[PDB]
Amino acid sequence: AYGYGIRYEYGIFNQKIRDGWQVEEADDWLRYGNPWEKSRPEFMLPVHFYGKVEHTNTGTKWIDTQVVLALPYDTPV
Amino acid sequence: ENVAELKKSFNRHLHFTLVKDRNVATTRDYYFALAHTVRDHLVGRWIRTQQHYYDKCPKRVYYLSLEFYMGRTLQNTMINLGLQNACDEAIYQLGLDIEELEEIEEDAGLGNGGLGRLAACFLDSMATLGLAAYGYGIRYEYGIFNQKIRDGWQVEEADDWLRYGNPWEKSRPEFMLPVHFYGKVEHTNTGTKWIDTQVVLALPYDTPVPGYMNNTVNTMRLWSARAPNDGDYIQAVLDRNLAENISRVLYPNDNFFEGKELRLKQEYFVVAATLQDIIRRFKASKFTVFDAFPDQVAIQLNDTHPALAIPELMRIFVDIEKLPWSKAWELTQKTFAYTNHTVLPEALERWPVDLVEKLLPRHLEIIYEINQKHLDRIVALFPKDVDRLRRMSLIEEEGSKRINMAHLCIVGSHAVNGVAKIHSDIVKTKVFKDFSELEPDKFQNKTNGITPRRWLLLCNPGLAELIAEKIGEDYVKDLSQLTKLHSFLGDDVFLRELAKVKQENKLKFSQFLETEYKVKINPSSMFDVQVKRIHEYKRQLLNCLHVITMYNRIKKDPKKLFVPRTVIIGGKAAPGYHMAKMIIKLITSVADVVNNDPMVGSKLKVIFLENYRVSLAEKVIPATDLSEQISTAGTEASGTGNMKFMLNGALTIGTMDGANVEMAEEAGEENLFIFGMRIDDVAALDKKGYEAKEYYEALPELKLVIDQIDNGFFSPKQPDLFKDIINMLFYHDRFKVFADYEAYVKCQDKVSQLYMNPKAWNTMVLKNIAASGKFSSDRTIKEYAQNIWNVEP
Amino acid sequence: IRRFKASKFVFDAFPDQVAIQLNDTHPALAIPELMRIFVDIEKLPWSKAWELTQKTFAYTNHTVLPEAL
Amino acid sequence: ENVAELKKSFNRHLHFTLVKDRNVATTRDYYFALAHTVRDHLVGRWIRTQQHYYDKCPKRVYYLSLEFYMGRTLQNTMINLGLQNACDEAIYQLGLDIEELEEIEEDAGLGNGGLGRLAACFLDSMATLGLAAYGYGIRYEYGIFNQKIRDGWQVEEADDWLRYGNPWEKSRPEFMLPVHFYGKVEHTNTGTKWIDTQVVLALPYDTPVPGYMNNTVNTMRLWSARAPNDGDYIQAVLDRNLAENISRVLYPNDNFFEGKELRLKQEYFVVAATLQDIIRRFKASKFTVFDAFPDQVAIQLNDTHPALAIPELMRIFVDIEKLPWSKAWELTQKTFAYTNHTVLPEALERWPVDLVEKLLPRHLEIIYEINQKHLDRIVALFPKDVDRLRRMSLIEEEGSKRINMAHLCIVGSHAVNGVAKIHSDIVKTKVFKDFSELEPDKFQNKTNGITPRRWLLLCNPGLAELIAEKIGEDYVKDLSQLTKLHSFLGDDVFLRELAKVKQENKLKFSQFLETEYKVKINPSSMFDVQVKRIHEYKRQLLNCLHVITMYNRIKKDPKKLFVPRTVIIGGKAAPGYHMAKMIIKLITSVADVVNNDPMVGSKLKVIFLENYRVSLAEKVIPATDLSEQISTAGTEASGTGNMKFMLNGALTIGTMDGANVEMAEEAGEENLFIFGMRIDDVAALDKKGYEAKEYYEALPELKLVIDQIDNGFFSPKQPDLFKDIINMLFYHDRFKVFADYEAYVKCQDKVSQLYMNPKAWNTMVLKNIAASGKFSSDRTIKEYAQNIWNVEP
Ligand SMILES: O=C(N[C@@H](Cc1ccccc1)C(=O)N1CC(C(=O)O)C1)c1cc2cc(Cl)ccc2[nH]1
Ligand SMILES: O=C(N[C@@H](Cc1ccccc1)C(=O)N1CC(C(=O)O)C1)c1cc2cc(Cl)ccc2[nH]1
Ligand SMILES: O=C(N[C@@H](Cc1ccccc1)C(=O)N1CC(C(=O)O)C1)c1cc2cc(Cl)ccc2[nH]1
Ligand SMILES: *Cc1c(COP(=O)(O)O)cnc(C)c1O
Ligand SMILES: *Cc1c(COP(=O)(O)O)cnc(C)c1O
Ligand SMILES: CC(=O)N[C@@H]1O[C@H](CO)[C@@H](O)[C@H](O)[C@H]1O
Ligand SMILES: CC(=O)N[C@@H]1O[C@H](CO)[C@@H](O)[C@H](O)[C@H]1O
Ligand SMILES: Cn1c(=O)c2c(ncn2C)n(C)c1=O
Ligand SMILES: Cn1c(=O)c2c(ncn2C)n(C)c1=O
Ligand SMILES: Cn1c(=O)c2c(ncn2C)n(C)c1=O
Ligand SMILES: Cn1c(=O)c2c(ncn2C)n(C)c1=O
């Protein structure tokens, strides 16, 4: 088995009670470092967003896209 | 188009076209049903394409050649039409294996090697670029012979490729034409008349040439010889074979001139038919009327083989269309362009005027007049220099008069090109100096190329997919896009994936080798490959020396670390080429000793790849680690196999000759294993004098090899079997094998070193593949379109 | 997909080597994305790819609350 | 320590730290495993060193700078720890190439050029001398951008140097600190209070600085910006980027002031954190308590960038530690020392008081008070001279009020120094005349230096070994020992060995050039190099004129003996520096015409060295024959690249400017190719009036070059592409390029003459290297230690 998700810099917020109301504080869980994760840079990948669809004889092409990279981090289970 | 409908069409053809059902259908039957199913997808665009050319009348390009080394058509057609994946699925769903059906198809081997394969790659490129191009050749009943090895020797078998029928060809009876021979000339008051001739009919067969994913389908028109219809009755009917013998068989000579009357008939046959077909088409279009001819028609001469086209066109314009000489000649020079494909003396076409007088009387007269107008000019511009007249004449006088067809092509053409920088240079400043000095702008270079469809997409889908997943499919039509590959030089994973692709190709090709040959293949060894026509200039002999060399080093120190190799050498030898046949026997003799010696084991295997042809090149090329391109510097006009291996992930070891020089420039010299003498070194060694007995005396490793070959170590039953080889090496070797021996071996040692460093080896592989873009035949044709034919996509 | 190709692999065996559980609808786009890869990248016909897809994916519904759909 | 144990440690890290084995390990993985293996050797001495400083409390030196151009750390660390040879052997025994692993390491390019590299050389020197020194900067997520050339133009790419992680840095979370911004001031009865501020946290990262073979390891502490922890929730979390943008990227400007609010934030950010960290440390040691502060702490201001430190310290002493102004001010002046690094008007920092009022309200008030006490004094000593008050004020009134940070540094410091005799002189008697007249003993000179470890031992091992075999290894710590080299001026063999070293460096660097660029390199040609940030004052343009000059002479008389050269010009241009970018395009345009003209051939090659950085300087510098140091006299404060080339065997051609003047003094003027106007000539030409159209009218060779550049000879597709360059040269050239053209070219001709006399050339080379001792940064720091910081090794 393999789990697949997103490595959020900020997880679910830390909740505090101020004057009886809930107050949210950023959960900066990686500030001091996480020894349990292992970057795997050789497996980085590009992800596309936006752009448009071109219908050519070589089939449909998704062009003019903005690219973002995906850097995986493995945690042992 | 979709899977379900492809299954129905297949079953429909198996039934109505093959008259079979699943219980009685043969493998050939399934293949024909699939072939017809795919073939139907071309018809619409083929009619549409040809109709478009008629309505818009773009300038037409005619590639005239005696050779078209087409290989197989089914897979190629499925890829260019975007049907492969669908057909693969449909066939699989019908319970069949498409790969097995594909092996049924006979190769259309109407060529000898490069020259014929270049023409085939050009058609693909011209169709992919959307040009109104037409290829014109001869529909040989028999192509290049099928090669077999019996008792270590090459044995030839007729290549009866049409026996079972050809679904990819379409007879065009309405365009049949008569071609004349012999007869005599009559200079009357109504024009010159070529009469009392022997007539042979030419029946054209059209084969569709589909471009890659563009809806364009051009035509390859091949002519067939047929007896006219107008002593013993039986013999007379049988004698009809004589005429039909004209398009019977392809002359099996690569880079060698054989002045056989039948060949001269094939040259004129294809030429007379083609030029009459182009003229008819011209006059049938929207068009003194001929002034626009050179603006509507461009004819490329593939080597001097179709040289007769120059006078044939003149004959037509003057005797048929009644145009004055001066005008006829002008249009001719604007119409023709000549490609010189070789510099080897033995390959030069020099026809005895006696032979030409008897067979083509009217053409001899025209060639003589062309030479007169030609020499009158020279005499004017150089009143003194009479030796220049002799060197530029279309006629050679020394002994029996002969015609220099190359000279004839130069004067009747407006463009002349070599097939690689170093070759074109040698052609312009050395071989045809006297001509280029007068007409400098006439000579050019058009470096050869190979189509990335058949030679990448078709032969190595794994590599095409890997590349495509990283930089898109853009590269198929614009190969210079492979340079983006440099972005991943430090990407360890992409390098492991690149290697996996090669290894899979090697594992598969290995299954082919253990199936066709006894030998056990070390799948981890290095695949050292040299496949091309057997020639002394290509030096399969040099390679053979290195193999025996490696063998001895192994026997000498069995415990000495040796990088394993599987040396593969293949190629057909011209039937009458004695030295080529002997070289084949030597290789087969070596393999026998090598592959069966317990001490060498899996360290070294040698294979003489039988029946090397296009379909076989598609299998071994993707599986190669090391490509041997070792002809003597200045002897290989260009080479194309070298490009094939470069595009498919192999490293190259060769001399600075042909296109090898340009490969080094594109990828960087350090990323190739260059060695040996260069154009200048060979010349120096010549002026001085090549004494082969010196290297033998100064190199012990070479001496051991030579002694083994000379004393019978590789032919115990026949101690002097290789005498002729030894004799040529020591006294008649124009290709200086012994002179590059030392550099070659040292180069080979470095290759072995690098092979042991996968990271380094594949890194270089990636730079080569990244630098192969330049060699796509689309780029070659692009330069032809712009600088010679003046046509646009 | 890269792992599948690097193992002892064309894609006919994909569903027999790969099972992808979609935790609620959040990763729903994985379905059309695989179709995209199969068809636009791997050049497989639609019918074949749709078949490989359904065999590969499994969906787990984690709620019926209208505001969570 | 020994080979076997280094192999085990390497394998131990590959396994436990990289979670890899040999079959799946990447090149980056091996590099990290080696890096960690070497890194372990520093820990013991790093803890020991810092513990020693705490127990003995020696005076501490803090080098405060916005820049640290560190380059790579692995090799440097192996050399200073005496591990290189052992690691090289271990790695080789593991089947790897240490050189390939080293190339994986990203440069820590947190600098723009000299100013940042000087700081880096200083840390090395301070650690080698055993000083209790600390460097303080900003840990930029992105350093100086990575440069690429696309279509002849410089293109910028983010230098994401931390992406894969940095083994040489150590987060120190327990020392995190808050830095405030904005807010307002409150003058209460319990002290002044700076409130309602925006807080940003600064997280320090420590990097060890190992001295050469001495067991000392100091620290380089770089600060990182982090958002505090105490509308739409998502946006709020995302908005945390704003604060963190403070230490996001290094401003890519060399010698140019950009008054951007973000930059002002970086200046204060690094300053507030540093001063609070030093104060805390001070109060945490063995210590009214602050009276001993200046005896325990010395802070050097690298240029005016960290000028805010003066008021920040005042703010701390008065508002936090509750010290009276008079005392606070005294301690401050005893603590700070200021180094002026430039005299170029455009590089001067002048912040609009409006910007400072909003961002640093409490600091504006303190700067105003400092100016009041400052001007009250002047008014006293010069009751009449009111214009003197305007010229010495910390505030400039002309138009929008601005703050002269340099003035602020002078009054708050007890020492001010230039970076070279001629520069310091100009700083003391001209630019700051009004200040030095009152406080003469305040101004000094501290000629720049470069570390012989990285810039000799690391970059040119062959030369270090040759030198070491002749005079011992003593010179590494005392470079003035190179003078013993004079003992071998007539030693023909030592001269042939000196030349071999250079040639090897040239052959290796040549492989780098043919690998990165198409061009074919003449390994025997003269390596003419000018690598530095692109500037009009540095005159890469002048060099370019000479190249075009040489090119024309070659075209003019192809058969005229020409001493072959490989001209290399490289350097990054500030992104918004238009003229610098245009200059790059010109050079690339020239190379294209030059490198591809058949008539010039191997006589001349031109290369625009892409992405010039520390690791690249280490490759090209050892490979240089001729070093171009040709900035206009009086414009280069000092220069350090010039020193690098001198120590590595290159001859210099330049003007009497910066440290070039001192190089001539040490080696003897005749042993350098000096030319052009001098500080006095340029002034005369100014008073008179520089009319560039005169030299163009009086020098045909220059006119030809100019016409070619202006008429499109180097940009056919864009005839007026270089219009802006021509326009500046003829009407807006403050660096008088045309004025030194003639002298420069004549100087260049003499260099060519000498190059043809190997004995003479290398003899001069030896005198230069022998005279380079003075330029070791150990000597520079020694003078800083004795005359400004008052600390001992
Ligand atoms: O960063 C080092 N160790 C690591 C150890 C670590 C790793 C993973 C989680 C927690 C701690 C470290 O302290 N951190 C990584 C975290 C971050 O990125 O902020 C904090 C380190 C050890 C070392 C030893 C020498 Cl000699 C020089 C530099 C060094 N850095
Ligand atoms: O020739 C027929 N189909 C063709 C189908 C075909 C066409 C072109 C190439 C290969 C196969 C056929 O079998 N061949 C042509 C080849 C040749 O030239 O010898 C072999 C055919 C189908 C059919 C069906 C009926 Cl009911 C009667 C006669 C028929 N002939
Ligand atoms: O992060 C580990 N090693 C570290 C090792 C390292 C440390 C510092 C610089 C480079 C490499 C790692 O791979 N990186 C830190 C870099 C980053 O900040 O992204 C990349 C690690 C080892 C390990 C071993 C197990 Cl069993 C589980 C989790 C693990 N993480
Ligand atoms: C490509 C090819 C050739 C040309 O090979 P060279 O090595 O260039 O002589 C010859 N024969 C076949 C079958 C080919 O596919
Ligand atoms: C040394 C160095 C410099 C300083 O060069 P000058 O010629 O003194 O301006 C600039 N950049 C780099 C990368 C250096 O190594
Ligand atoms: C006469 C002849 O077959 N020439 C061949 O032509 C091909 C195609 O141009 C070249 O690649 C090759 O080197 C050359 O030997
Ligand atoms: C502002 C700035 O970057 N100044 C630079 O400082 C270095 C180090 O002192 C000098 O060598 C150089 O000539 C000068 O241009
Ligand atoms: C290439 N070649 C041939 O193909 C050949 C030949 N002699 C006969 N043939 C067929 N010779 C000498 C030759 O060099
Ligand atoms: C088949 N074959 C040849 O083709 C051959 C030969 N000797 C020379 N040649 C060319 N021998 C002995 C032979 O058996
Ligand atoms: C050095 N330099 C720059 O770095 C610069 C500039 N203009 C913008 N920039 C970034 N100018 C005029 C300049 O001289
Ligand atoms: C990339 N680039 C520039 O950077 C540039 C320019 N013209 C001026 N500059 C600065 N052009 C035309 C250009 O392509």
Swiss-Prot record, chains B, D:
- InterPro entries per UniProt: Glycg_phsphrylas (IPR011833), Glyco_trans_35 (IPR000811), Pyridoxal_P_attach_site (IPR035090)
Recorded catalytic activity of this chain's protein: [(1->4)-alpha-D-glucosyl](n) + phosphate = [(1->4)-alpha-D-glucosyl](n-1) + alpha-D-glucose 1-phosphate
Q: Could you name the Gene Ontology cellular component terms for this entry?
A: cytoplasm; cytosol; extracellular exosome; extracellular region; ficolin-1-rich granule lumen; secretory granule lumen
State the EC number(s): 2.4.1.1
List the Gene Ontology MF annotations in alphabetical order: AMP binding; ATP binding; bile acid binding; D-glucose binding; glycogen phosphorylase activity; identical protein binding; purine nucleobase binding; pyridoxal phosphate binding
Describe what happens upon changing K433R. Decreased acetylation
Residues modified as N6-(pyridoxal phosphate)lysine: K644
Q: Which UniProt keywords apply?
A: Acetylation, Allosteric enzyme, Carbohydrate metabolism, Cytoplasm, Disease variant, Glycogen metabolism, Glycogen storage disease, Glycosyltransferase, Nucleotide-binding, Phosphoprotein, Pyridoxal phosphate, Transferase
Phenotypic consequence of K759R: Decreased acetylation
> Phosphoserine modification sites?
S487, S524, S602
Which co-factors does it depend on?
pyridoxal 5'-phosphate
Q: Which family does it belong to?
A: Belongs to the glycogen phosphorylase family.
Report the protein's function. Answer: Allosteric enzyme that catalyzes the rate-limiting step in glycogen catabolism, the phosphorolytic cleavage of glycogen to produce glucose-1-phosphate, and plays a central role in maintaining cellular and organismal glucose homeostasis.
Query: Entry's NCBIfam families?
Result: P_ylase
Q: What is this protein called?
A: Glycogen phosphorylase, liver form
The protein's organism comes out as Homo sapiens (Human)
